[PDB]
């Protein structure tokens, strides 16, 4: 009934993790519009390093393309491809 | 090659997701400590709702206990059990 240390440590250590990101967080210049869904799941470096002087950063990145809806008031519905940055590999590196 | 709309929509929609959380955020009376790991994986509501008028909020919670290494000044390294809140169910509700 208690998670063991090594299992928490390994599961929490710097690695790509599925992260739900708001499309505005990625693209603040798009904040005038409405997206559906308004957030997307993206692999992004997450977790912690052995020392608060290291940071978890990507060492391999790629684009992923997703079908998203975008609309404006009193307008037609658009559906189109939208690309986002994902993190494929992460390592702990000096800040 | 392209993630299809309904897949993106279902995967992004409000639900419990594994989230990496800093322990200090959960134990604010213990910011004098250094923890190892310094963050833990927790199930927490995430993702988006259908409207800017709704928020994704927990509607069912429970605890999980993990073994965490802890040190503070005038102390050596200890290992101890720390409990964290998890989210078991999430719903979209008006802000």
């Amino acid at each position: 009934e208690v998670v063991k240390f090594m299992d928490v440590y390994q599961r929490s250590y710097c690695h790509p993790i599925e992260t739900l990101v708001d499309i505005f967080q990625e693209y603040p210049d798009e904040i005038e519009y409405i997206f559906k869904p308004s957030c997307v799941p993206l692999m992004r470096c997450g977790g912690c390093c052995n020392d608060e002087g290291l940071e978890c950063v990507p060492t391999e990145e790629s684009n992923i393309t997703m079908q998203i809806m975008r609309i404006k008031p009193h307008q037609g519905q658009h559906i189109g491809e939208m690309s986002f940055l994902q993190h494929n590999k992460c390592e702990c590196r000096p800040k | 090659e392209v993630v299809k709309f309904m897949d993106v929509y279902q995967r992004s929609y409000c639900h419990p997701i594994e989230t990496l959380v800093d322990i200090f955020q959960e134990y604010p009376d213990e910011i004098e400590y250094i923890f190892k790991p310094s963050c833990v994986p927790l199930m927490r509501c995430g993702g988006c709702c259908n409207d800017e008028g709704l928020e994704c909020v927990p509607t069912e919670e429970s605890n999980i206990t993990m073994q965490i290494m802890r040190i503070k000044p005038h102390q050596g390294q200890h290992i101890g059990e720390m409990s964290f809140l998890q989210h078991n169910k999430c719903e979209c509700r008006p802000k």
Binding site: M6, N50, D51, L54, E91 | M69
Partner: peptide, 14 residues
Amino acid sequence: CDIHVLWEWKCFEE
């Protein structure tokens, strides 16, 4: 036990 690499248990005993 390099600080930049994921650690095994031995590391946490050093």
